[PDB]
Amino acid sequence: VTHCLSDIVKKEDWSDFKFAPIRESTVSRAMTSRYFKDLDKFAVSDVIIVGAGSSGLSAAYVIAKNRPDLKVCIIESSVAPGGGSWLGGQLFSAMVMRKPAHLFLQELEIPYEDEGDYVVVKHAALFISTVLSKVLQLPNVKLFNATCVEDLVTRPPTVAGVVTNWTLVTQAHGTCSMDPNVIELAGYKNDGTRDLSQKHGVILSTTGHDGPFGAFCAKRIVDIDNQKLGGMKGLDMNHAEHDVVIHSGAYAGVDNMYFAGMEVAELDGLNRMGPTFGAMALSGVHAAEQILKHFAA
């Protein structure tokens, strides 16, 4: 039997095992210094992705892989990212993805079972953990998990950033009050006005349809903007997956604002697809394409 310590630990009872000694504050400072550096670096971001589910992570991979220089800030309200992609339907495991979504799986080197017009990843968790791993390895991506977007930063008749807090704080806003923080989009001067020498940053909202804060940016934009929440319709896989992919990308009516995933179905009043995931990944690819074109222009 062989493992990473086979050459270092020679006693069967592991009596010769040891860690190098440590002081508790060394650990605290190592963590906190790095988190402040993140908060400082990403206080102005090029791309803010709200929601690290299948659509948001798929988009994050394509964006960051193509433009490793861009600061991609991912805000995820739950402790565990991945949203609704840890399971298939009814607590079962298998993740069905219709072709050509398998081309995304090949790119990420995610194995699957080919069934002709669709493929199956043997566990939804395998897809999402793989995408997470690959996204997180990229140099200018930051995952702020346990952190919720509570509002939008705006400028008079565009988005200009997001308003953030610890999720557990947001969930206690009903119950002394606790202010949020802010993450700003690229493109402004120290007087708060537009700097046209800079490319404007963008928000991609991929907060799904479900859960405590589902379809968050859609509701807030509708709350402020002429626009109404379409409302997700009944389940119809052929029409739902097609429309979600096609409708994903730039939002008409607000500048520098993008959507993907099931949030698009809520906003545009499209069908839903239930336990199949091709459109989540590919809507992320589509949104990412449009976002990458914005930064190339």
- Is residue 180 within 8 A of residue 165, CB to CB? The reply is yes
Contact flags string 163-202 toward its own copies, x per CB under 8 A: xxxx-xx--xxxxxxxxxxxxx---xxxxxx---------
- Shortest approach of its own copies to residue 15 CB, angstroms? 7
- Shortest approach of ligand 48N to residue 55 CB, angstroms? 3
Please name the residue that has the structure tokens 């809507």: 283
Among 56, 112, 114, 129, binds its own copies (CB under 8 A): 129
53 binds ligand 48N per the rule CB under 6 A:
yes
55 binds its own copies per the rule CB under 8 A:
no
271 binds its own copies per the rule CB under 8 A:
yes
Among 78, 165, 248, 256, binds ligand 48N (CB under 6 A): 78
56 binds ligand 48N per the rule CB under 6 A:
yes
CB-side neighbour CA atoms (13 Å) of 222? 16
- Is residue 121 within 8 A of residue 94, CB to CB? The reply is yes
With CA atoms as reference, report the closest residue to 45 among 278, 295, 297.
Answer: 295
Q: Which residues pair with 259 in a beta bridge?
A: 205, 249
Residue 217's Cα: distance from chain center in Å? 13
- Shortest approach of ligand 48N to residue 63 CB, angstroms? 15
Q: Please report, as a single letter, which amino acid is at residue 217.
A: C
Query: Known binding site for substrate: residues?
Result: 55, 76-77, 84, 149, 179, 209, 262, 272-274
Residue 33's Cα: distance from chain center in Å? 24
- Is residue 162 within 8 A of residue 151, CB to CB? The reply is yes
280 binds ligand 48N per the rule CB under 6 A:
yes
Q: Is 282 exposed, middle or buried (0-12, 13-18, 19+ CB in 10 A)?
A: buried
Among 45, 77, 165, 256, binds ligand 48N (CB under 6 A): 77
For ligand 48N, the binding residues (CB under 6 A) are 50-56, 75-78, 81, 83-85, 148-149, 177, 179-180, 206-208, 210-211, 213, 216, 261-263, 272-274, 277, 280
